[PDB]
């Protein structure tokens, strides 16, 4: 619903795997409440 229709969104190529990674990061960081990225990979460094 937020998505904008543009010629750039239609033409430009992105990595689909990077889009999947972003889609998972924006949910996990919203669950943990932390807004930083590298802080989340630091707290993911130790988790089991």
């Amino acid at each position: 619903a937020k998505l904008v229709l543009s010629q750039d969104n239609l033409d430009n190529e992105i990595s689909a795997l990077s889009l999947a990674n972003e889609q998972l990061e924006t949910a996990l960081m919203a669950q943990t409440g932390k807004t930083d990225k590298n802080k989340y990979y630091e707290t993911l460094a130790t988790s089991r």
Partner: protein, 48 residues
């Protein structure tokens, strides 16, 4: 502009490298829907 054409004529370079030889700044802004020169220089991929 004519230095840009000359510095592309000799050395056989891309035109943006010839512009960077011609004392032009690094563009943060994406040109023609790709990675910008700042991002393709530094954040392709972002380090860690």
């Amino acid at each position: 502009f004519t230095e840009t054409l000359l510095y592309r004529k000799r050395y056989g370079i891309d035109t943006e490298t010839a512009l960077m030889l011609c004392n032009a700044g690094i563009s943060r802004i994406s040109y023609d829907g790709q990675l910008s020169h700042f991002d393709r220089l530094f954040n392709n991929p972002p380090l860690n």
